[PDB]
Amino acid sequence: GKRTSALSFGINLGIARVPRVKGSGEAALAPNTVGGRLAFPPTTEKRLVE
Amino acid sequence: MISSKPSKQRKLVYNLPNHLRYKLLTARLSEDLEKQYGIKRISIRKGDSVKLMRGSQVGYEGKVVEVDRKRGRVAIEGLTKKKADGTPVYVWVHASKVIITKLDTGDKERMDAIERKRKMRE
Amino acid sequence: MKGTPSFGKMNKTPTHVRCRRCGRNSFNARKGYCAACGFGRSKKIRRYSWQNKK
Amino acid sequence: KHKSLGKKLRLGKALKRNSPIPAWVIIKTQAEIRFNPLRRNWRRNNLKV
RNA sequence: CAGCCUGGGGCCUCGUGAACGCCCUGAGCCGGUGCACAGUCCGGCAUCUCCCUACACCGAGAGAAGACCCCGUGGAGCUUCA
RNA sequence: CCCCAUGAAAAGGGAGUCUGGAACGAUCCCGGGAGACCGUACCUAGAACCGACACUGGUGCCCGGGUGAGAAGCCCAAG
RNA sequence: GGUGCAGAUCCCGGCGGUAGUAACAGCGAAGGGGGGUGAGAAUCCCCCUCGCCGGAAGGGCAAGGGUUUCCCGGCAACGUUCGUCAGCCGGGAGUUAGCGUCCUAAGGUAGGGCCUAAUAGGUACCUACCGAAAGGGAAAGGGGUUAACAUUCCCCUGCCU
RNA sequence: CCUUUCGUCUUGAAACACGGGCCGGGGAGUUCACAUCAGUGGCGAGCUUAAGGAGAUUAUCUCCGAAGGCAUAGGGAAACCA
RNA sequence: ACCUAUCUAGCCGAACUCCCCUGGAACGGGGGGCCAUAGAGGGUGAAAGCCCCGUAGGCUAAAGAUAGGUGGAAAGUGGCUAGAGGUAGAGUACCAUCCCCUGGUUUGGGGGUGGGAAGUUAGGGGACACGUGCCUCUAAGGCUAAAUAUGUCCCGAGACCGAUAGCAAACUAAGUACCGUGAGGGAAAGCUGAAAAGAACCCCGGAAGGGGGAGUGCAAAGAGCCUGAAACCGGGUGGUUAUAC
RNA sequence: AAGCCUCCCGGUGGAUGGCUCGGCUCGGGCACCGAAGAAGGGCGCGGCAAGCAGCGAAAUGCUCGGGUGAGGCGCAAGCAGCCGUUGACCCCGAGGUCCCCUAAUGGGAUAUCCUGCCGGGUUUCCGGCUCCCGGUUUAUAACUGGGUGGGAACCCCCCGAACGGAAACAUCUUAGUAGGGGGAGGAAAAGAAAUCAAUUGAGAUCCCCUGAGUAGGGGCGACCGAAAGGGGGACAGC
């Protein structure tokens, strides 16, 4: 999901309701919304053995 | 050595290349067939006849008249379900639930395939 | 004017046209160069370390 | 039109065929309503040369 | 110091057909209380329901992280004898 | 007439002069032969281009009578 | 263990109310009658009349769009209404030149060389070339013919190399 | 009969502060490494094997491998003492 | 050339469709019988070791490719001991200065700038400099097997997700439609049942997988096709209203 | 009369639940293509043919062997017709064709297009034409014969950032990373000591674990940060 240049529209736009980040027309990249990168994605670097 | 993931396996049977289609046709012969042929299973060909063991129409004997090689199922005459109009359409029954009863000895190229399976002399 | 009429005069030729190499209508005739297919001043193909986000 | 045969000289995927689906093919597919999604139009579009 | 008339809107009728304010639908008014100006709380006054039009008085109406003042060991810019 | 502004260059043509060449020989007329390749539809804008639209915005360019100086206004020709 | 949600002016999808409300006025156009088609007609067609434009709503010409042109058949949307109709959809057809290509200014490039560590960098010098559909630049018009384009096809007169 | 609307910021401020149309789906203290503690177990003046090798039904597994690190004495700069 | 092996290919490969019941279908329940070096797994009208494939194990080459052997040729050709003699890489080391970096610090390496050696009886190095002894190496030219860096790709496995997640991508085309003059940004969208058996046929309308009736089929939620919640709206059921939250 | 509330039913949306020819991680194999014309694009090509995929005017496939063995004519069910037992379709290998641009190189390009000069046979057409190395022929004329670009990451080498951190900030650090340029291969690099260490010892290089945040550096600030030795792997040296 990181393959984006998405960004906030800044503030005082109002039309940009929230500092949600959007790419030149549509929102992405945020942990909370559609398709973007996970909150805390599991990786192979995590320990496994006891 | 071939994998055992379900996904890959299903890909072969949904994508069966042409020269391997006999695989989903071979059905069990009868005892009398193997009695003079010394062979258990073999691929179906046209011009043959079969008997059925499963399905609502169990116990039928017909003739090998229709086939679906690419996906692997056949049909036999004298067994149809009438459409709304009244013309018959062929009942589709899989080789998996059939037993062959006789074959065609008029090819000389299907014959040697029979021979090479270590069946005894002739 | 800065509003719509600024878009008015915009019927003339595209300042970037079909460059023969990369199939992108991005050949700046005016600069004698394509900014997309690289044809014009690099013998090599234009390629960068940042074609995308990494 | 003095188009300098770089766009009309090329014909096909360039300067051709925003075409309707073939008829008999639709019969074959038995599909509900067959389309080419690539459908475009001069008034609403800007062909990228 | 106002008045009359005309065209198009505005009125009505057929067809098409949106967006704004929405914790709510429970909000009438008046004193009072309380963040020191209530729709619900307190005490009175009233208050039948439904519909259409005109008014924007109120809804501390909506529009927009106030354009002002200050803070952040926050930016950018300009200047010089930092 | 004006200028402390003096108002583009090639290819392409034509002619003039001198050298060499062969004697046949046309920038004349008459008859004959040929002459790549590619542009070529439509619209030019109150619906055909752009401005997200079948958008009073812009982008153009050029061109009847009378009344009337008039391409002003009016009306009416062509459409 | 990606782990229990009402919010984060959250994201995304669906649907509310204001609601058949606003608007479908405003920039000087306007239609009416009779007939036809078709299920269905203010809106489409036929006739007549009438009003308006009329240095532009007319006429011819670009860059651009790319079939928007024409024929035949259609209307679920698409058209600010409707719609038998259309630049819309569906089935077919349609541009011809002995009467741009050449050269060149602003300039530009590509190479040889002068630097740059290198370069897809700069380059005063030299060389080669690109650079105008309104610059210059050989030579035709007339009539006539298809629904569709024409100085190009048919005829005569030509004309230039 | 008794009953100020959710959450949050906040001395109280929530009710004239903010964010709040409805419904559904998504959605936020995780990973590693070090340090230190607790709890738990194995062994014990030791502990501990890593990296790594061999065999194996082959990443599981068994054996081997102290390599090393911590503790096992501190003081001071040292010479050293201990 | 030949031989051997390996890779490109396909091939062999066990055991029940036995009985009763349910079930549209048995791949279910009960009973009965069997292979197994093969009970990974997949398919077939459901949950099948023995219905089908595959599996453990084994087999395949014309023709190619890879590896090895089998082949041929050329060049240079004593060993030790003692003595004598000779060779052994320059702007290179090294030094001063400026700069760069690395822990390299009065101590490292590199470069610019200026100087600048010895060179076999040579030199360097052995944490500031110098000297002395002791120890070990020989640059200013080459060249080099393996032991490791990675997934454009191909096999295999998985305490990775089930269609707003999973990489953007599971779909008729995905960097596709598209927004941008431009570098660029960047989508949405899976399920008919097993077999279309896709409702023949009759009535309405012009038509619409539209109405109705019939029919297929276990089932039609039969094309907009699995299941089918709410926000919503409509009909109905049950209460219930115009002096009132 | 509105309704109000709840509930039954229907439609409007499709979450849930289920299913998956998809991706994702891992490990292991494998691991250069290119002027004999790449990769990358642009065009065409089937009976009725749009996209994909495949294909190159020899366009849904051409030939020859090998296997295969009765249907085939893709995605994808229609009309019509054909190929197939004289061995199809398919798969393997070998060939043949293989348009245009493209590093594109006859010359030119704001044309995926136009356009020369030689030599060849000759109807169609075929071969050659920047910067170099070495030869023919005069000592400058042409002629004989062989370095360019791409490739997911990885590798090598030059050039070379700010953001932040120090709660400010300028030395320092973030850091030779981001990035630029060149150049390769399937691995690259490096590789035989002017090496160490120190009681007279070891014996190329590389990577792995330790040594070790030790040594040592710095407004002594954040921080940076070895070597030697030991233990492993293969250990080749001309």
- In order of A7, A11, A22, A35, A37, the CA distances from A19 in angstroms are 9, 7, 9, 18, 17
d(CA D6, CA C45): 23
CA angle centred on D2, ends D47 and D9, rounded to 5°? 60
If you ran DSSP here, which 8-state letter would residue B101 be given?
A: E
Which of the nucleotides in strand H have any atom less than 7 Å away from a protein CB atom? Answer: 25-33
CB proximity under 8 Å: A 3-32 to C: 3-5
Q: How many helices (H) and strands (E) does chain D have?
A: 1, 0
Return the beta strands (E) in D1-49 as ranges. Answer: none
Token duo for residue B6: 């379900």
A44, A22 contact by CB (below 8 A): no
B72, B21 contact by CB (below 8 A): yes
Task: Check whether C40 is labelled as a binding-site residue.
Answer: no
B46, B64 contact by CB (below 8 A): yes
Experimental method used, please? Answer: cryo-EM
Asked if C14 and D7 come within 8 Å (Cβ–Cβ), the reply is no
Whether D48 CB is under 7 Å from strand F: no
- SS3 state at A32: coil
Which residues have C-beta within 8 Å of that of residue B44, sequence separation ≥ 6?
B25, B26, B27, B50, B64, B67, B74, B95, B100
Breaks (C-N over 2.5 A) in chain A follow: none
If you ran DSSP here, which 8-state letter would residue C30 be given?
A: T
- The spacing between the Cα labelled CA in B95 and the C1' in J203, in angstroms, equals 76
DSSP letters, B3-68, are ---HHHHHHHHHS--GGGGGGGT-EE--HHHHHHH--SEE---TT-EEEE-SSTT-S-B--EEEEE
Which of the nucleotides in strand F have any atom less than 7 Å away from a protein CB atom? Answer: 38-43, 45, 48-54, 57-59
Task: Check whether C19 is labelled as a binding-site residue.
Answer: yes
Question: For C27, phi and psi rounded to 5 degrees?
Answer: -95, 110
B118 dihedral zone (left: phi>0; alpha: psi -120 to 50; beta): left
Q: What is the resolution of this structure in A?
A: 4.9
d(CA B35, CA B39): 8
D5, D18 contact by CB (below 8 A): no
User: D7: which chain C residues are within 8 Å (Cβ-Cβ)?
Assistant: 18
d(CA C49, CA B32): 74
CA distance C53 to chain A (A): 5
CA dihedral (B94, B99, B103, B108) positive or negative: positive
d(CA A32, CA A26): 15
CA distance C25 to chain D (A): 6
B88, B82 contact by CB (below 8 A): yes
B13, B24 contact by CB (below 8 A): yes
Q: Does C53 touch chain A (CB under 8 A)?
A: yes
Neighbours of A, requiring at least 3 CB pairs below 8 Å, are: C
User: Which residue in the block uniquely carries the two structure tokens 């990168």?
Assistant: A37
